[PDB]
Structure formats: C-alpha cells, structure tokens
Paper text:
Vasohibins regulate angiogenesis, tumor growth, metastasis and neuronal differentiation. Sequence analysis of vasohibins identified that they belong to the transglutaminase-like cysteine proteases, with conserved catalytic residues and a putative Ca2+-binding site. SVBP binds to the N-terminal structural core region of vasohibin and stabilizes the complex.
Here, the crystal structure of the VASH1–SVBP complex and a molecular-dynamics simulation study are reported. The overall structure of the complex was similar to previously reported structures. Importantly, however, the structure revealed a domain-swapped heterotetramer that was formed between twofold symmetry-related molecules. When we measured the angles made by the Cα atoms of Glu71, Pro68 and Arg64, the heterotetramer was most extended, with an angle of 112°.
Residue numbers in the entry:
A (entry chain A): 56 to 304
B (entry chain B): 26 to 53
Write the structure that this text describes.
C-alpha cells in the first residue's frame, strides 16, 4: 500500500522543465542547435547506450594496471559537452556523502567533468591501501579568462601519477611514473604551456582517507602555491615541502 | 516500466547530444 513517488530519490528521469532547460541551452551554445534538438528529440533512431561496468580486480592485479582500468572506466562515461551539469557536488560534504554520490554516478552513468572524476577516482581506489590519493587544483589564465581545473593526484610506492577528466589528453591521466611531486606538477604546467595557458596557482590537497564511512571533509587547499610569485626554484621546493608534510602526516 | 522507458530515453538523448557536441568541440 502506497504507490512510490519518492521525491527524495535522485536519478534519471528528470522533470520536464529541467529537460527543456537543457535543450533551450543547446540552441544557444551550438550554431545549428535548434536543428540538433529537433533531430535528436523524439527520433526513434537513437543508439542504445550501455551502462559501463565498474572494473573488478583480482587481488594479484598490480596497482598500475588497476589505475589504468579505473581511468578507462572514468573515460567511458565520456566528457560532458552537453552544456549541462548532471551532478550537484558540494566539496565540503563529508567524505561518506561524497562516496554516496560517486556510487550514484556509477549507477546513473551520465557524462562527467573534472570534479566528478576526482570523486570517482577516490571511490574507485579506496580499496587500494598502498595508494595515496590527493586532489591537485590548477588555476590558469588565457586570453582574458581564468580557468580552474582539478585532478586526483596519486602516489604508488613512491611514484606520482594522476587520474582525471579533461577535454585535453595531457591534462588528466598520468601513470604513476614520476619520482617527485614537482615533476608531476611541472608536467601539467608544460601541457598548459603547449596551449598558451599561464599557470597562476596550484592547490595541493591532503591525502584522502580510504574509509568510505569517514565523516571527515577533503582538505582541498592544504598547500596553495602562487607560482608567479614563487618563480622557479622556490616553486619546486614548496612542492617538495608539501610532499614531505604529506608523507609524514 | 514507463519510468524505466523515460529513463532510458533521456539517457539515450543525453549521449546522442553529447556525441554532437563533442564533434563540434573537437573540430575546434
């Protein structure tokens, strides 16, 4: 008794006003947007989309292979180009709440951007106890605009890599291969330089608990580096100073 | 389930839309 009408349950399907809001926006950000909407909506001709399966690992599977499969799962959700934000992410939520969201993201299987990927990367690597995970944020400048981008830094047995999502191949995944944290960060700085972006700020998070019931928040801004005020060698030493206060804390 | 059908329709339309927007973005 009691037909389900669970207004507190999230997930697709979404209401008709929200649905229109996306298509209205699509006509605005695409040259022939109205024709895109007309052709996609109602067409009985749309491909089926499979739900990506979250990888499962044998206990003997090495951590670098697990990282590649985790990054690949994150990629097959696809980068969100639709104009919409599909998930509301409050960065000050307790980790346990952020992990509920990550699980929901795996069940809804919608496109994502950089922050969803960071959340998913933590969720999907909590089960790897020898892997340290910590967010890395970049603020860049280009052509009259400031841009913000975040990835999940990782450390496996002394080597630094990264999981993430970006429109650019060189601004996300990095295999755990760098010997130092400054090499990982300078690698992202070079990739930004390739596209004439000026790196203004690097924010280094603290390492994130592996306990998915943890009520602690993520420390997103444990170290903040003003790269232009630092120069070059003070930058490298401040990065190595955070990494040591990361391995001792 | 008519809700399940609406769900699958919306998600299918979301990814078709994302396909078109990626093609626009990647060619620029």
């Amino acid at each position: 008794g009691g037909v389900p009408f669970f207004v507190n349950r999230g997930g697709l399907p979404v209401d008709e006003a929200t649905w229109e809001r996306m298509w209205k926006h699509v006509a605005k950000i695409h040259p022939d947007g109205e024709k895109v909407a007309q052709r996609i909506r109602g067409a009985t001709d749309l491909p089926k989309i499979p739900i990506p399966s979250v990888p499962t690992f044998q206990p003997s599977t090495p951590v670098p292979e697990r990282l590649e499969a985790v990054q690949r799962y994150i990629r097959e959700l696809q980068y969100n180009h639709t104009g919409t934000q599909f998930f509301e992410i409050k960065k000050s939520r307790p980790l346990t709440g952020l992990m509920d969201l990550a699980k929901e993201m795996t069940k809804e299987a919608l496109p994502i951007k950089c922050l969803e990927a960071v959340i998913l990367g933590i969720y999907l690597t909590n089960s790897m106890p020898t892997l340290e995970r910590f967010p890395i944020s970049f603020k860049t400048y280009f052509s009259g605009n400031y841009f913000r981008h975040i990835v999940l830094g990782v450390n496996f047995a002394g080597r630094y890599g990264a999981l993430g999502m970006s429109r650019r191949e060189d601004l996300m995944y990095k295999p755990p291969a760098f010997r130092t944290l400054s090499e990982l960060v300078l690698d992202f700085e070079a990739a930004y330089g390739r596209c004439w972006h000026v790196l203004k700020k690097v924010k280094l998070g603290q390492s994130v608990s592996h306990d998915p019931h943890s009520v602690e928040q993520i420390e997103w801004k444990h170290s903040v580096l003003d790269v232009e005020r630092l120069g070059r060698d003070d930058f490298r030493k401040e990065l190595e100073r955070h990494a040591r206060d990361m391995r001792l804390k | 389930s008519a809700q399940q059908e609406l769900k699958q329709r919306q998600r299918a339309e979301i990814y078709a839309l994302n396909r078109v927007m990626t093609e626009l973005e990647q060619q620029q």
